[PDB]
Amino acid sequence: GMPIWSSHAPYGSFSRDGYSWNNDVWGPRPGPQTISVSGVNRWSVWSDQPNTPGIKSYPHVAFNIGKPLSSINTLSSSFNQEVPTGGAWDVAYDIWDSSNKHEIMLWTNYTGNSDGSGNVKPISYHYAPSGAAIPVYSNVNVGGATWNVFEGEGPDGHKVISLLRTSKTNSGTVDIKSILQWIKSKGYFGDIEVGSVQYGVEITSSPGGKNFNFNNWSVTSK
Ligand SMILES: OC[C@H]1O[C@@H](O)[C@H](O)[C@@H](O)[C@@H]1O
């Protein structure tokens, strides 16, 4: 209702009690974007990005872990959000290891489809003739939900593993510890040191301005 912090500046940031918020917007001609924080668990962002190729922004909240996967007893997160209908975007968890050589994404609600097609697509090495990203694993039930798994590389060669929920949702709880354990079991990485747990929206297009409310977001690390 009343903000404890707000910014419309690209890369404006604020931190309170272990949580930080980042107004990340880059690129040739970024559109206006304003993030507001009402408290440690509740925040919002409005963004007006043009109907052009590529991700323009990732407004997000972040929480630091800094622990090896093996030392972790509990790593879960709860989200509750209100999203617009149109545009090109994906609301996602962004989980990094401390070295930033492995990125794990969990897409909870998005404008594309779980099979890798749509106006947004997961990072992927391979695409189908229709242009849909090709999943490496399908209908995987892990960490409290069913997902489609995709594999790709970022521009600096770092590995990206993306899980797209087969059923989109605007509220839920993810068991990140178990998801990372399953990814380790397929051999993508070893006893990774978990660095950051992030949550926000990657906006490709939101012409006319679109609003995203994160009414609750919390991380439980033990
Ligand atoms: O290929 C498009 C991709 O660009 C990356 O930077 C993003 O993190 C992915 O989530 C996105 O789908």
Side-chain angles (χ1 to χ4, degrees), residues 54-149:
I55 291 169
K56 316 301 190 304
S57 66
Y58 184 54
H60 69 276
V61 58
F63 189 91
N64 226 288
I65 310 297
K67 293 172 32 102
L69 184 54
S70 59
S71 73
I72 290 156
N73 309 295
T74 290
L75 185 53
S76 65
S77 194
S78 291
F79 63 101
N80 182 36
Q81 70 219 7
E82 297 166 332
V83 299
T85 298
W89 46 263
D90 57 269
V91 179
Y93 276 95
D94 210 30
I95 301 151
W96 296 87
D97 67 331
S98 287
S99 65
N100 303 130
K101 294 266 145 272
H102 299 95
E103 189 190 355
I104 301 92
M105 305 202 76
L106 321 172
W107 294 25
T108 63
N109 199 358
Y110 42 104
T111 55
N113 312 120
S114 66
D115 65 6
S117 66
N119 64 4
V120 283
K121 300 168 183 76
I123 285 163
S124 181
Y125 286 126
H126 305 296
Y127 302 91
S130 58
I134 300 167
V136 297
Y137 302 90
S138 284
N139 304 300
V140 178
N141 194 289
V142 73
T146 301
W147 315 84
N148 284 337
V149 184

Side-chain angles (χ1 to χ4, degrees), residues 4-16 19-24 35 37 60-62:
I4 60 163
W5 173 82
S6 195
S7 174
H8 54 73
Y11 291 95
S13 49
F14 170 85
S15 53
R16 180 162 300 183
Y19 291 81
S20 65
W21 294 263
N22 303 271
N23 201 30
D24 289 10
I35 190 172
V37 181
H60 69 276
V61 58

